[PDB]
Amino acid sequence: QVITNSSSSDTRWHEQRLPIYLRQHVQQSAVSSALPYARAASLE
Amino acid sequence: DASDWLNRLAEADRQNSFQGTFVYERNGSFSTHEIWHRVESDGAVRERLLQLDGARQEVVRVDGRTQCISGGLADQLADPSQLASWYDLRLVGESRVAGRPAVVLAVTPRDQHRYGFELHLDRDTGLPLKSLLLNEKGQLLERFQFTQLNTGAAPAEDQLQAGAECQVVTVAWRSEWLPPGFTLTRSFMRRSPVTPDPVACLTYGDGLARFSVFIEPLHGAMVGDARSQLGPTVVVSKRLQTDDGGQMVTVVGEVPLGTAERVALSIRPEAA
Numbered sequence: 482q483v484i485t486n487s488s489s490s491d492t493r494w495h496e497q498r499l500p501i502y503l504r505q506h507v508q509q510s511a512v513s514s515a516l517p518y519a520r521a522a523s524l525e
Numbered sequence: 526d527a528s529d530w531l532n533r534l535a536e537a538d539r540q541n542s543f544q545g546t547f548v549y550e551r552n553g554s555f556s557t558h559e560i561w562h563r564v565e566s567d568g569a570v571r572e573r574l575l576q577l578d579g580a581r582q583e584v585v586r587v588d589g590r591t592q593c594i595s596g597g598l599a600d601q602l603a604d605p606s607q608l609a610s611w612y613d614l615r616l617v618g619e620s621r622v623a624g625r626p627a628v629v630l631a632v633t634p635r636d637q638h639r640y641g642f643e644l645h646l647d648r649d650t651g652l653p654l655k656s657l658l659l660n661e662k663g664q665l666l667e668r669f670q671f672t673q674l675n676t677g678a679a680p681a682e683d684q685l686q687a688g689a690e691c692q693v694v695t696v697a698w699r700s701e702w703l704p705p706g707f708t709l710t711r712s713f714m715r716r717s718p719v720t721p722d723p724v725a726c727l728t729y730g731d732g733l734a735r736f737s738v739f740i741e742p743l744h745g746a747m748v749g750d751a752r753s754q755l756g757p758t759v760v761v762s763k764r765l766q767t768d769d770g771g772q773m774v775t776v777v778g779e780v781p782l783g784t785a786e787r788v789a790l791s792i793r794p795e796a797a
Binding site: 482483485486490491494495497498501502503504506507508509511512513514515516518519520521524525 | 547554669
């Protein structure tokens, strides 16, 4: 979902990192209360 | 009074056993879940959550403690008293949700740096029936809503037992700017998903919204901005000029784009 941006060098760099950091934020927020769980479950 | 309803909300989860089904929706995802919530005689909360559509994602909690959790929710796992300072809390009327009478609370930001909520609270118990996350223009970013809530009678013990997919289970950086009411929740180190490099993590919250900051070394590389959005969750990455090769600062959370950007551009190394 990486926007983007405009540089194939920069897209490849960010695409290997941003999805993982996104997942970490949402998953950790769910374990720290049904709404946070639901956001985590919406991933993938 | 909205303050009183939010205090009742804060305690409703320890004073009520219940079972129910709810939906969660954002741009790009719609899903149904079931919850079983038992308050034991000592006041401990035992809770099971199960996704009803698609994969059987599951978590079981005993008070704060995750007893088991399915793998797809765990692969990246490493108090409303002050809320009125940053949000205006307003009782705006009455509603009906899942066939039950509710009160409507508007939780409106007192600045541009966070999102507001429309909260529908069950009249009989104070439990949340509906939570709508709204942006600055009043547009819907996410919907959390019960379709049935069965209160009073406690879930039977068999309903609290999960299935097989439920698996039994100082950073030298700071922000120079935060929106009012946000405070550091936690800081820790992880490793880059790609390289050997350590990545610093800082997490922040105001009691309602959370965001996380990731700081990753660039080793002199020319890598530019990035941004992304997943429903209410924004992602912004901005390069930070440093004397150690530059860093990429990524901010992820349920805050407006401009807040994540301003945080990302405000991250600084700690000085001796």
